[PDB]
Symmetry: D2
């Protein structure tokens, strides 16, 4: 009955189930949650662990004594439940000081503060056992063209990530970074707007091996992109260090629906890919229970995230294992796609008259791809309609 | 009066002014143009040169004798006019054989044919003096999830680009490649959908120095992305080898409006950036005179491409040179954005109490960015409304 | 096994399965189909009937003798198979004469021709038994602001529809009109871009009772709108005279995927609504088998349209019939939504202190809507995962 | 120098310049403004007046004594400055009680409360001299399909608007209603998502003459629609009772940029249309000074709204008055578009062989529309580049 257990590696941000329901036009609809209660309730639902922004776990401006008490209580809840903390991150977007960015703020003093705030929380993340440190630069960008010279901003962004890499290397930490793209919101345009832009940026860092991406379903979908395709490119690059799962209904404000909502067929193809590729990282949900809901609805929404993942996992596995689907994949030449174009080499290709001079383009053109039959087998599997 | 001359490096594809006006629901509205007439008419408008797909210049399936005559006539028109050919490309999308791709077709024989067709035209491009060879893989992608394993497809795409790099190196050619992203159309989703994805992909090629991007205004805008931002990242990476200029009104079918149409403020910020950065490549238009137009409207539309570039160049230069704008840029701390965050180094940053322990976050937060005043100065400059 | 029969009222345009695969960048991939063969093959798949544009059935420019032979052969195929023709329409978009519109062309002579062409085909539609006459004004609109005064264009559009209403009334025909909205493509913006705009326009016609809408799934989705919501408003207005079913993956070019592809949850909620409302019209597919496919894939794609409708019908019916869902609907106050706000009347409402002075807004605010539990029951039903 | 005066009828919501800068991921960046200070500062900039939600002027939950003092101070500021209040509206979206809607909340008691809250503020609006009462039902809609039966919701929405019409008629008030569409945000989909849907809905109300639309630039643009086209349809229907002016960069979250920002050419064509049509209502700005700004930037942003309107007004007037543009409009047959298609009547059209039998479709098709020359004249006028 699609019941999650910790072995499924499902994780949730404190800020997800703890979202009080403030949106772009309305006040909170739910009380704040104590992180300890979220840990306990998520454990009861079969979660593996939780994640946090610094400021979710320790109220901004806490004294050292307050900070230690907040961490102590949280660690007791983790120990009580067996929950893990595989990932943490920094809040460089809520406080008004970050209104023009953290690492790419025009104000140099703000950039320095952003780095210090991040470094403090990296230490805590390591203490709590996190393997991955996410950076979502939600305030990095602009509403107008003159406000942000993007080459200068990318110089500053590279400088910041390089310094963080220097820091973790200097401390002997094993933690790695995962940069999270988003195309817009809260800035009119955000820097590193997609998986591609973040992958490209990482290749200019001094120690690129320390950085990957943390793609979020809804974020790539806010640019109308195909999330499974972007995940495939991240996997191809060896850079899928973490992932955020949720739902999004098209190009509009960031909805953060529970996973499986939004584009359900995209959710199916995503799970198919993660499972086929043997992705071994957390299945992390960055979602918002809608502000229509009370706390019972919060936990229902969270449970539904995990349930939908497990249903889609079953259906994708059944699809790939079905001999009729395997025959259809051959009919559509997916096997040929996985074979080298010219393992014979360039000169052999140039000398091969079957590749040009004597290639029957019309016969090749006439061969149907049989993709519709393949896709209706996929639909039948997804819907449990084989027959 | 914003009159273009060849020194402005404006170029046009044969397929642009030669577009007969077939769209997704209608037949041609204009006769085919002889490339020779397009060269002559573009030269008369002040163009610098022209570009071509193989199949624009030599009808598909031409005999060797026909091919030589087509090239001979074209070269006579170039010589007659002083027009150059700075870029050429391959048509790997029109012929039905490419219905599932060229370099990433599931059928291996089609992939081999795509490479042979490309190599043949690289030789011709070099003969005609082209410095850049564009590849727009418009058929690389999918309408459905099972049809295309994207990791396998990227393996094939890398194999193809690596072989082309091997080929140009083997012939001692100086030509470089420019990969053109597009998010969708004609495929439901296209591989390397944005500037970021193409930049990232290039970093996995064997000889990455031989490849850059050929971004198109409308294509990034079809993903709702900020084209000037993407161009800034391409410049930051040193990969803006070529550019396609046109207009697009938002997220919808690829309109290919004349440059300046569509998002006019984005056109202003693009020209500002290209000129500020000293981009030295062709200002190439990949546009379609709308099918409402007759041939007089074709040449009016082409002229308007160049006129709009020159108006925006004047206004951007005036903006940047205006002492009041320079003061506003300082007021908004664009100067600070261009200064290193921590040239003092990591340890100095960690030891700097002004960066954290004694940082007055509220005072920093209270400092307005003054971006609206800056942007209204930009608006006033664009519209010729200073005062 | 979700097998369609004619009693299901599934219909297809000749132009759908007959699409030769010309798209915005490529040549045909399939031969033209004889309408007679399409009728026979669709009947074999369990279709109820077919629809046509004038020019699909009778080649443009046919002599009277040719026209009679084309119609005679078609009527023999209908008689041979038991297929019906519930709807027909006019092609006012392919021929270059319609490059600026039919009914709202700037050229008056073109507007008059568009009306004559339409009237000729209304007569034929009636002859063949059609109850509904669709008008999709794909060329009505503009790429630029000065080209089309939209108030004048709406005057001309109203004049045209009024004349068609006068014509059918004058002939005693029972046929009604269904106006099909689309937001863009092939024009940069199309007039009457959504279901709302078409409904509003109908209310200004002289005989509004003769006109409804023909909404298409993909078209409303090209504006990022919720298709089930638009269908509900059309039903609410009593104007759902016909519908086009297909799939669309977001805001981009008009894909015309087979029904069930694209937004699958939107397809589920659409079928739920059509069945709940007792929509009695044709379940018509306006789709394109992708140009990757050969003719076997054409018929597979067509079959899949009908199969997906029948699967979703089963799952929606199961959802609505499930006592646990009925309890959840009460928990979410869907029953209360269907009860009048103030059947007691305005004065009673003003005098009701429980509605304001003594309304406990905080207690009301605290009541969760329980929408996530309801939606996960819907997801479970769709996926066949109850348990 | 494009200086606004009250005669220009520029108005601003209290909530616009008073926006404290809370967005979907961040805390306030500016202190709350006293409405009295906003009235004074807007008057100094040349504004004509201000608008308000009930809860902007009187803090939610105010005692009668507090309410009277808030109104008294506001009326003194209006009297001190000569500012008017042409429009008011209700906040049916901020308070958590409205989390599932006001007029279409599933909870009947909430619907009744929404009406009482609205009626109370209609009385105040009339007291303060407002001619128009706006309703933006930002919470009316859904995130999931089962949560909202849209036919039932439209029944409730009609009931609510009918009761408000009954109320204003019963009091002898001259005020009229303006319904504001928005496609999404804060709900996943909002009911009456576009100008078309709102126009259509109004035609089912008991007293349709009392209701028009209040279209907002950014809202129609969030559906990728052409705002000038939608305004033309509203004008055509005689329903443009009020308008909200601002900017939006494409399909994404509601940006509420200052007017002129976003789609600048759409702003030009909008002003051209409002001025050509003789729209006589307020030029109201519903905008947000970006949260990057301090209060000096708030007033700069507000000033820029009015400045951009006045620049575009000048350029549109110059365009329409230019004899070369008038010649181009004739060349493009805009004059013919404004002439009846068939004032001769249906029978004359049927009998006119020049309309069909003897219509030279090829000669008509060959006639270019000359739209590109016309549009480049428009561009030249907008940019002050004639020559
Ligand atoms: Ca409860
Ligand atoms: Ca292999
Ligand atoms: Ca072979
Ligand atoms: Ca002409
Ligand atoms: Ca510097
Ligand atoms: Ca210092
Ligand atoms: Ca076959
Ligand atoms: Ca009832
Ligand atoms: Ca009661
Ligand atoms: Ca200041
Ligand atoms: Ca007239
Ligand atoms: Ca005449
Ligand atoms: Cl898992
Ligand atoms: Cl709050
Ligand atoms: Cl609360
Ligand atoms: Cl509580
Ligand atoms: Cl310093
Ligand atoms: Cl980069
Ligand atoms: Cl790396
Ligand atoms: Cl990986
Ligand atoms: Cl959903
Ligand atoms: Cl999909
Ligand atoms: Cl709830
Ligand atoms: Cl709640
Ligand atoms: Cl130039
Ligand atoms: Cl053609
Ligand atoms: Cl022709
Ligand atoms: Cl001709
Ligand atoms: Cl072989
Ligand atoms: Cl990559
Ligand atoms: Cl490189
Ligand atoms: Cl470069
Ligand atoms: Cl434009
Ligand atoms: Cl811009
Ligand atoms: Cl023309
Ligand atoms: Cl033409
Ligand atoms: Cl049915
Ligand atoms: Cl063809
Ligand atoms: Cl063929
Ligand atoms: Cl064949
Ligand atoms: Cl006449
Ligand atoms: Cl209307
Ligand atoms: Cl009616
Ligand atoms: Cl109906
Ligand atoms: Cl799909
Ligand atoms: Cl849905
Ligand atoms: Cl096939
Ligand atoms: Cl084929
Ligand atoms: Cl005005
Ligand atoms: Cl706040
Ligand atoms: Cl503050
Ligand atoms: Cl202050
Ligand atoms: Cl009651
Ligand atoms: Cl309606
Ligand atoms: Cl009315
Ligand atoms: Cl009006
Ligand atoms: Cl802007
Ligand atoms: Cl425009
Ligand atoms: Cl400021
Ligand atoms: Cl501020
Ligand atoms: Mn998100
Ligand atoms: Mn995230
Ligand atoms: Mn293009
Ligand atoms: Mn291009
Ligand atoms: Mn369509
Ligand atoms: Mn259709
Ligand atoms: Mn807005
Ligand atoms: Mn508004």
């Amino acid at each position: 009955n699609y019941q999650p257990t910790p072995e499924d590696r499902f994780t949730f941000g404190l800020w997800t189930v703890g979202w009080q329901g403030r949106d772009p036009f309305g006040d909170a609809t739910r009380r704040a949650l104590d992180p300890v209660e979220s840990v306990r309730r998520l454990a009861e639902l079969g979660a593996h662990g939780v994640t946090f922004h610094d400021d979710d776990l320790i109220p901004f401006g806490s004294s050292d004594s307050e900070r230690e008490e907040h961490v102590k209580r949280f660690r007791q809840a983790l120990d009580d439940t067996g929950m893990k903390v595989p990932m943490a991150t920094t809040n460089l977007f809520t406080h008004p000081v970050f209104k023009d960015g953290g690492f790419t703020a025009n104000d140099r003093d703000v950039r320095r503060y952003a780095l210090r705030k991040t470094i403090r929380n990296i230490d805590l993340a390591v203490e709590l056992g996190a393997e991955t440190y996410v950076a979502w630069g939600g305030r990095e960008g602009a509403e107008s063209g003159g406000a942000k010279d993007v080459r200068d901003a990318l110089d500053r962004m590279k400088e910041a990530f390089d310094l963080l890499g220097e820091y973790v290397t200097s401390q002997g930490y094993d933690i790695r970074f995962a940069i999270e793209p988003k195309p817009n919101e809260p800035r009119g345009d955000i820097l590193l707007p997609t998986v591609g832009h973040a992958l490209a940026f990482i290749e200019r860092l001094e120690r690129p091996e320390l950085y990957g991406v943390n793609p979020e379903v809804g974020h790539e979908q806010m640019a109308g992109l195909n999330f499974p395709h972007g995940i495939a490119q991240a996997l191809w690059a060896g850079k899928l260090f973490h992932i955020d799962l949720n739902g999004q209904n098209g190009i509009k404000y960031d909805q953060d629906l529970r996973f499986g909502a939004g584009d359900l067929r995209a959710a199916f193809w995503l799970v198919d890919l993660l499972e086929s590729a043997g992705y071994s990282g957390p299945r992390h949900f960055d979602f918002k229970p809608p502000r229509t809901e009370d706390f019972d609805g919060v936990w229902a929404s969270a449970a539904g995230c995990m349930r939908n993942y497990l249903i889609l996992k079953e259906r994708a596995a059944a699809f790939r294992a079905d001999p009729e689907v395997q025959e259809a994949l051959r009919a559509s030449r997916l096997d040929e796609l996985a074979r080298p174009t010219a393992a014979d080499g360039l000169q052999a290709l140039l000398d091969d008259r079957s590749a040009f001079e004597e290639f029957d383009v019309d016969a090749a053109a006439a061969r149907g791809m049989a993709f519709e039959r393949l896709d209706q087998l996929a639909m039948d599997h997804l819907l449990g309609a084989r027959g």
